[PDB]
């Protein structure tokens, strides 16, 4: 069941019901990338 | 569209006074006659503002954070400048809201919503036409709109008093703008005037976004221009006063503790 | 939401639209809203 997704990064945690549909092209300091090169990622990962 | 203006014109940055505004009601309880204490986020007192004093050359609309709700207020003829974007990156990746006015209600939208590098409401000079507010641009990946009623709801240009001192506390709490309103007759020449006004629970918001990075929205009057007026902005943060109600049941005073010895003292 | 025991009256005040209660020395309610069009203070000592 590949559809829907969930997120596990963010530099930092969540203040309380504050919700974003932000999908970034991840990198562990900023860093605005095509991903996946080195040290850039997605965080959307599906279920299995 | 990334549609762009040129005269971009930076003050020195000026300085006011908070005087004694960003009072409200806490809660939704009346009480009568009494002193009661509460902790919570607020204007502190007596403290720095940055005016914004726009002419045909200064066009004040940088970028501006939030920092956990702002006191806002703006005096003006005819309520010029309406239009506030609250969002995170600003941009087509930025899932923000966005509350702005159809000249008789207000409209108020959040989703992924692209900038212009500058847009403008292409007002014009003696008829206050809403030309290009267009600005609710793209849409996908989206989350809300709400329309609420409408009401006198002016634009145009005027002379005489400052008689619209409106002013607005954008409080976020738990995705929550809270959001205030009051009204004061004055005409001050260009800055704040002195004095308190007490502000009222219009609105919450059940949105719950990472706002962050806001603007306002002003009109080009019709390339841009404005009249002789101001907008205010300052930041909130969590101290704790006292309210004074009168047996009318209005608060009528208030003293924060964290001002001075006297005033802590006060609420001691 | 509100229960309890009392001698309930008419409201006496300036009561402002948007409240509701009235909480009035310390928590204790004394002066409500009816939700079907009437305004009410509401005095909890029955006797004692």
New interface residues.
């Given amino acids: 069941n590949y559809n829907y997704k969930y997120r596990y990064l963010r530099h930092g945690k969540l203040r309380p019901f504050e919700r974003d549909i932000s999908n970034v092209p991840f990198s562990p300091d900023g860093k605005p990338c095509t991903p996946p090169a080195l040290n850039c990622y997605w965080p959307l990962n599906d279920y299995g | 569209r990334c549609t762009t203006f040129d005269d971009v014109q930076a003050p020195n940055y000026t300085q006011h006074t908070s005087s004694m505004r960003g009072v409200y ?1 806490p809660d ?5 006659d ?1 002193l009661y204490l509460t902790q919570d986020l607020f204007l502190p007192f007596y403290s720095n503002v940055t005016g914004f004093h726009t002419i045909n050359h200064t066009f004040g609309n940088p970028v501006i954070p939030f920092k956990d709700g702002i006191y806002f207020a703006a005096t003006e003829k005819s309520n010029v400048v309406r239009g506030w974007v609250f969002g ?2 600003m941009n087509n ?3 923000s809201v966005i509350i702005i006015n159809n000249s008789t209600n207000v409209v108020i939208r959040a989703c ?1 919503f692209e900038l212009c590098d500058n847009p403008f409401f292409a007002v014009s000079k003696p008829m206050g036409t809403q030309t290009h507010t267009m600005i609710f641009d793209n849409a996908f ?1 989206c ?1 809300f709109e709400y329309i609420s009623d409408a009401f006198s709801l002016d634009v145009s240009e005027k002379s005489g008093n400052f008689k619209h001192l409106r002013e607005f506390v954008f409080k976020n709490k ?2 929550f703008l809270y959001v205030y309103k009051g009204y004061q007759p004055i005409d001050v020449v260009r800055d704040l005037p002195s004095g308190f006004n007490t502000l ?2 219009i609105f919450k918001l059940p949105l ?3 706002i962050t990075n806001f603007r306002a929205i002003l009109t080009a009057f019709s390339i841009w221009g404005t009249s002789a007026a101001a907008y205010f902005v300052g930041y909130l943060k969590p101290t704790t006063f006292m309210l004074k109600y009168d047996e ?3 608060i009528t005073d208030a003293v924060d503790c964290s001002q001075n010895p006297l005033a802590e003292l006060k609420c001691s | 939401g509100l229960t309890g025991t009392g001698v309930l009256t008419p409201s006496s005040k300036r009561f402002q639209p948007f409240q509701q209660f009235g909480r009035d020395v310390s928590d204790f309610t004394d002066s409500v809203r009816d939700p079907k069009t009437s305004e009410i203070l509401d005095i909890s000592p029955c006797s004692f």
Avoid at chain 2, 28 to 32: N, P, Q, Y
Wanted: charged residues 20%.
């Fill in positions: 009601y939704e309880i009346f009480r009568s009494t995170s990156t990746k930025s899932q992924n990946n989350t738990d995705g009222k629970p719950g976004i990472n009318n049941g209005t």
